[PDB]
Amino acid sequence: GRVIRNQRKGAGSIFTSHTRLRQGAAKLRTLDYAERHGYIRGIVKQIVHDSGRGAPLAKVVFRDPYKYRLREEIFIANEGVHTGQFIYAGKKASLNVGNVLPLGSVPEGTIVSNVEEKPGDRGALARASGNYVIIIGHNPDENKTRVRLPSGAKKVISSDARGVIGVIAGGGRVDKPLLKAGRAFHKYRLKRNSWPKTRGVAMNPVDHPHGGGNHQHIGKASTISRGAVSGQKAGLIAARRTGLLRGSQKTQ
Template identity: 80%
Template sequence: MGRVIRAQRKGAGSIFKSHTVGRKGAAKLRVFDFAERHGYVRGIVKEIIHDPGRGAPLAKVVFRDPYKYKLRTETFIATEGMYTGQFIYAGKKASLNIGNVMPLASMPEGTVICNVEEKVGDRGAIARTS
């Protein structure tokens, strides 16, 4: 077996290093729990932020924990038309509005959607744009 000569090695370029220092965090949906399966949970959009290395902005959404006296901050991909102070409803019985998280079975055909779960509970894997 031969070897790669020096001239070929020089043209190979350097190892790519992704610039991930300024990232704001992973964009995920809420954990799919009992409250979301049988009703809905209300959250409020606290801020919409730019995430370097991503095409869509992120939204910091604060939910009250249904089991503990605690506030949980989730990072969603901000949908087009989302604003700070907006109420976001996540669950089976949530209404069909911009930014709400609901199962595909409860949406009518032709609805514009984003951030779809491939498997239940994977917190969003398909069509992750606004």
């Protein structure tokens, strides 16, 4: 047997990220004396398009605590932040669309973006265009904070962990039909080498499990167990159900 497409993406030889035009790594400020005791100001001097990211980035420049100079940050622009605006970052900082605050510091029910998992990891959750985390309440002693990540999961993380007020810009991008092959083509031209895709069941047994047969069909359950081996996990991996989702989903 050959080696199936979704194994070859591993040593990523043609499979890596098309990275030439990207404005840099979007990350929060490194967590220092300013942000963890008080606050600090920066000016958003530019918000700009990143190639291969749906949501605009915001270039947000600060001063330096310990040397005469400037320091420049790449943020993901939460919807509404604007050039020239002032941005505040710290424990004792304010509650406005754009500042960064420890999760403990916001009244429950706030809305934050680019939020850390561990504090000081400089950004992590709700970063796509339109996503955010809502906060559903804190735990006074052992300073945690329970939240609802965009996938609907409900995770508990540190209150010293930072987020930034608002939803992320560029929302609803995906309500618009890609419409032709080409727009899809360019979409992924700036992302990676994943498009277009060829139905396993169009190829030959060498090439796939789904491959072979005098009729184009799958032949066995396309639900593949969790503890399957590389070379087997093609189709619906480890599914606990299948079929058209009848009724109201939504998280409980």
